[PDB]
Design a protein around this nucleic acid. Structure first.
Ligand SMILES: [Cl-]
Ligand SMILES: [Cl-]
Lengths: 167, 168
DNA sequence: ACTGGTTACTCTTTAATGTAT
DNA sequence: ATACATTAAAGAGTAACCAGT
């Protein structure tokens, strides 16, 4: 179930049509995927071997890149799309706070700046379920959120740093 | 050149007096000084051996720093001020554009996006004059600017990069 | 001199960490 | 638990470089 002969040709067909498209339209399409799943650009740079500064300038600004290096970018894009779907159905990077959970954390901080462990774990289920809805997946699949899984320790680390922000 | 033994004792009292003052006030004095001379934060990290994220957060945001680390940075503040004096009295890193030179270059780009070489040297002398006035030194002394000295090559590279930014 | 593709370097930001009340 | 004190890690931004009409 890991791979199929036809879908492997479909992956090669997708990267073929993606190279034929406007590289900016694909850049916006890829940047929106990295933001929805909070996958760090370091994973892209470490896997494909591209330049961090070059890849960042291409996604956020549209800096033109040659088709040979762009092909390795689209190759990782199509493969990462399958790995994400499988890892969520079957259920190294640094944690990243999603924008959907940040709104819930700012609500709780405006209410009270020192929640109890029960209130922390309650916000964990709220933020995890929120991160799943953002990624378009079901809540029980939150175990597939991976490195971006909201934990009680991480919620406590967020509230502790936000108290330090008032100075 | 060598600091008089009496002069060195003054530096120590300056560090202790700066340690007695509020750390956020001394942080703003050092940060504004770095912005006036375009001194890279990497150079302060290399000398004082401090953490770049710690020093950046203690200067820009004013994060709590220990008295020992603040004293090591305050020791660099006083030695660099004097070293800048001899750096410029002798006149008789990487380049970093200044705010006044960036505003003048914004004027020329609005008038001519492709200036001639004659227009480049005239802008070089104007920017070097404005950068000298920023730190309160005479326009004649520019060797002390060193890495932050304006050059026609840097002006042409500034307009070429602005052309790439204008394309998007 | 020139656009165009590319990048070493810089510095802010972030989530995480260690510890003595 | 938790405010000081701290930071390894990510990433956008800057000024610059190399090639080839
Ligand atoms: Cl994910
Ligand atoms: Cl200087």
């Amino acid at each position: 179930e890991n791979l199929s002969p036809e879908e492997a040709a479909h992956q090669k067909a997708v990267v073929e049509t993606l190279l034929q498209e406007d590289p900016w339209r694909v850049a916006k399409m890829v940047k929106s995927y990295l933001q929805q799943h909070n996958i760090p650009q370091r994973e892209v740079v470490d896997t494909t071997g591209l330049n961090q500064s070059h890849l960042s300038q291409h996604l956020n600004k549209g800096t033109p890149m040659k088709t040979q290096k762009r092909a390795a970018l689209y190759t990782w894009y199509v493969r990462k799309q399958r790995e994400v779907a499988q890892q969520f159905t079957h259920a190294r990077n640094r944690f990243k706070w999603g924008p959907a959970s940040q709104q819930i954390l700012f609500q709780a901080y405006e209410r009270q700046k020192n929640p109890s462990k029960e209130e922390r774990e309650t916000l964990v289920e709220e933020c995890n379920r929120a991160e799943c809805i953002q990624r378009g997946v079901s809540p029980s699949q939150a175990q597939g959120l991976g490195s971006n899984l909201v934990t009680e320790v991480r919620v406590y680390n967020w509230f502790a740093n936000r108290r330090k922000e008032e100075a």
